[PDB]
Design an enzyme around this catalytic site. Structure first.
Site, PDB file in Angstrom:
ATOM      1  N   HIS A  43     -14.330  24.444  13.412  1.00  0.00           N
ATOM      2  CA  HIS A  43     -15.506  24.055  12.877  1.00  0.00           C
ATOM      3  C   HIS A  43     -15.304  22.991  11.799  1.00  0.00           C
ATOM      4  O   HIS A  43     -16.370  22.419  11.495  1.00  0.00           O
ATOM      5  CB  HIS A  43     -16.311  25.339  12.298  1.00  0.00           C
ATOM      6  CG  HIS A  43     -16.035  25.843  11.025  1.00  0.00           C
ATOM      7  ND1 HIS A  43     -15.002  26.916  10.745  1.00  0.00           N
ATOM      8  CD2 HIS A  43     -16.408  25.304   9.828  1.00  0.00           C
ATOM      9  CE1 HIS A  43     -14.913  27.201   9.636  1.00  0.00           C
ATOM     10  NE2 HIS A  43     -15.777  26.185   8.876  1.00  0.00           N
ATOM     11  N   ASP A  99     -11.805  29.835  16.561  1.00  0.00           N
ATOM     12  CA  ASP A  99     -12.147  29.063  15.579  1.00  0.00           C
ATOM     13  C   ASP A  99     -10.696  28.417  15.024  1.00  0.00           C
ATOM     14  O   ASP A  99     -10.293  28.633  14.021  1.00  0.00           O
ATOM     15  CB  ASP A  99     -12.862  29.479  14.405  1.00  0.00           C
ATOM     16  CG  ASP A  99     -13.243  28.495  13.307  1.00  0.00           C
ATOM     17  OD1 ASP A  99     -13.239  27.185  13.791  1.00  0.00           O
ATOM     18  OD2 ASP A  99     -13.842  28.694  12.273  1.00  0.00           O
ATOM     19  N   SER A 196     -13.109  26.723   4.058  1.00  0.00           N
ATOM     20  CA  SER A 196     -12.940  26.747   5.795  1.00  0.00           C
ATOM     21  C   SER A 196     -11.632  25.870   6.065  1.00  0.00           C
ATOM     22  O   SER A 196     -11.268  24.761   5.563  1.00  0.00           O
ATOM     23  CB  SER A 196     -14.149  25.836   6.417  1.00  0.00           C
ATOM     24  OG  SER A 196     -15.306  26.469   6.343  1.00  0.00           O
TER      25      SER A 196
END
Ligand SMILES: N=C(N)NCCC[C@@H](NS(=O)(=O)Cc1ccccc1)C(=O)N1CCC[C@H]1C(=O)NCc1cc(Cl)ccc1CN
Ligand code: NA
Ligand code: NA
Lengths: 246, 27, 10
Positions: A43, A99, A196
């Site tokens: 992502h 992910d 992230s």
């Protein structure tokens, strides 16, 4: 990172900063897994709901860092990307299942006191350490609440799968695990925006090496009571990693 | 295979300030 | 932006 602390110098020598070339800014975390390969969240590179789709040329890898904003002359190293690999079954539409992405660097990076790769788990290490109540460590330059001067660190316990599933309406998969304290536990902390792609690591008590068990993936809010942080289960996607590198 | 051994910690037999929290959870 | 400038070389 919410409710963490400033890292010690050299505490996370595999920590990588994904850097935007223009406008110059922090995109994400990442980790060094060899002299030429960097691991992150898919992502971070591809997220169509937010019109994110970065190409190799949009980005830089900054390795050996401590300060968020400063250029750490004679200590960090800045690398260009040769190629990006996103898992072909990454599920951005639904729940961020799988992910994960790999980044191949143009040139090998020099290891130093501040630059060193982390281990990836084998099956036995995964089985030993990925257990409810066992703590890992996540690091990042992300938001302190739902901007730090230096790299932040927090230790968080792995949460039981039914507790993870009951904390959300999102469908959780075997490629994810969750971590964080329960409201009843008193302590707190979480990853947040900008963390992230960074690593969730554990130190094996058997061989005294650090292993990256997770990748910072998603959370409803940051450090919310009754919610948890969700991490990509690295060992579960190890087949894909190896195939790519090989 | 030198992965996961930090130069300023494991390589020097020095511990960071909170690694023992993790060890103590591996129960 | 809040980011100190990196060498042009990069
Ligand atoms: N229903 C879905 N399909 N998605 C689940 C929402 C996932 C998303 N959450 S979110 O950006 O804060 C938006 C949100 C906030 C509160 C309640 C619901 C949603 C989220 O965390 N995302 C969506 C895109 C990237 C990732 C992210 O920001 N990750 C960073 C992160 C990672 C971790 Cl481990 C914990 C917290 C945070 C923040
Ligand atoms: Na649920
Ligand atoms: Na929480």
């Amino acid at each position: 990172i919410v409710e963490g602390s400033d890292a010690e110098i050299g505490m996370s020598p595999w920590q990588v900063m994904l850097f935007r070339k223009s406008p110059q800014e922090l995109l994400c975390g990442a980790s060094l897994i060899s002299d030429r390969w960097v691991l992150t969240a898919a992502h971070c590179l591809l997220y169509p709901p937010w019109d994110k789709n970065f190409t190799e040329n949009d980005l830089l890898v900054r390795i050996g860092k401590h300060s968020r904003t400063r250029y750490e002359r004679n200590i960090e190293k800045i690398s260009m990307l040769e190629k990006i690999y996103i898992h072909p079954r990454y599920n951005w539409r639904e729940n961020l299942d799988r992910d994960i992405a790999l980044m191949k660097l143009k040139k090998p990076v020099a290891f130093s006191d501040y630059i060193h790769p982390v281990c990836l788990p084998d099956r036995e290490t995964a089985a030993s350490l990925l257990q409810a109540g066992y703590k890992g460590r996540v690091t990042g330059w992300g938001n302190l609440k739902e901007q730090p001067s230096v790299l932040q660190v927090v230790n968080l316990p792995i949460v039981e799968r039914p507790v993870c599933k009951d904390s959300t309406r999102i469908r959780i998969t075997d490629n994810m695990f969750c971590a964080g304290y329960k409201p009843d536990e008193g302590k707190r902390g979480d990853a947040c925006e900008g963390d992230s792609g960074g690593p969730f690591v554990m130190k094996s008590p058997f061989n005294n090496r650090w292993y990256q068990m997770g990748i910072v993936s998603w959370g409803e809010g940051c450090d919310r009571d009754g919610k948890y942080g969700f991490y990509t289960h690295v060992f579960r996607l190890k087949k894909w990693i190896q195939k790519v590198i090989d | 295979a030198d992965c996961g051994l930090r130069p300023l910690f494991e390589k020097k037999s020095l511990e960071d300030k909170t690694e023992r929290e993790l060890l103590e959870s591996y129960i | 932006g809040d980011f100190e400038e990196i060498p042009e070389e990069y």
